[PDB]
Amino acid sequence: RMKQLEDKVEELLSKFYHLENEVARLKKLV
Amino acid sequence: RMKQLEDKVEELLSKAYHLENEVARLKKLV
Amino acid sequence: RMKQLEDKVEELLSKAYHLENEVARLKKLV
Ligand code: NA
Ligand code: NA
């Protein structure tokens, strides 16, 4: 069942990557 | 170990949805 | 195996916590 977890962690890696950008986006605008 | 990882990963996935929303809110005010 | 996943989670947890702070920061400055 580690594969389901690995895929979720991969999904978490990517969401976190996108949130960092949109936050840094907000940081330049504020 | 294995169960705790899966739970934490699920804990993380929901925190991501909440952050995704908090970021969206902030965008409407930048 | 599991260790790779716990490492990754520890990372995402750090990221999540810092995004939380950054979100808390941006909130205070619209
Ligand atoms: Na929200
Ligand atoms: Na917000």
Side-chain angles (χ1 to χ4, degrees):
Chain A
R1 30 152 166 157
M2 232 164 268
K3 193 58 191 145
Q4 292 96 323
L5 207 51
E6 276 154 351
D7 298 337
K8 272 174 169 205
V9 166
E10 168 255 323
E11 167 198 353
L12 274 164
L13 255 53
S14 56
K15 294 182 147 301
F16 275 46
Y17 175 66
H18 285 310
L19 288 147
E20 285 166 12
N21 299 332
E22 194 124 348
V23 153
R25 204 87 37 99
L26 299 171
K27 279 218 257 161
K28 301 312 157 302
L29 284 178
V30 287
Chain B
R1 202 141 185 225
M2 183 48 168
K3 162 151 201 303
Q4 283 78 11
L5 223 37
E6 284 148 351
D7 302 330
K8 206 88 181 61
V9 164
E10 164 254 296
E11 174 185 332
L12 277 176
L13 294 152
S14 304
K15 199 135 98 151
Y17 170 71
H18 171 82
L19 280 182
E20 252 160 32
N21 285 336
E22 298 288 60
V23 178
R25 275 203 27 85
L26 278 35
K27 250 196 145 175
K28 283 338 284 163
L29 320 153
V30 305
Chain C
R1 195 160 79 161
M2 258 162 304
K3 162 178 218 59
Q4 262 87 20
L5 278 177
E6 331 209 351
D7 290 349
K8 291 301 158 182
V9 164
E10 162 145 38
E11 278 181 54
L12 291 142
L13 191 81
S14 163
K15 290 188 192 312
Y17 286 146
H18 181 248
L19 294 164
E20 258 146 38
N21 290 335
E22 269 310 337
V23 158
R25 279 192 250 271
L26 291 158
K27 281 182 173 321
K28 199 47 72 202
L29 266 158
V30 182

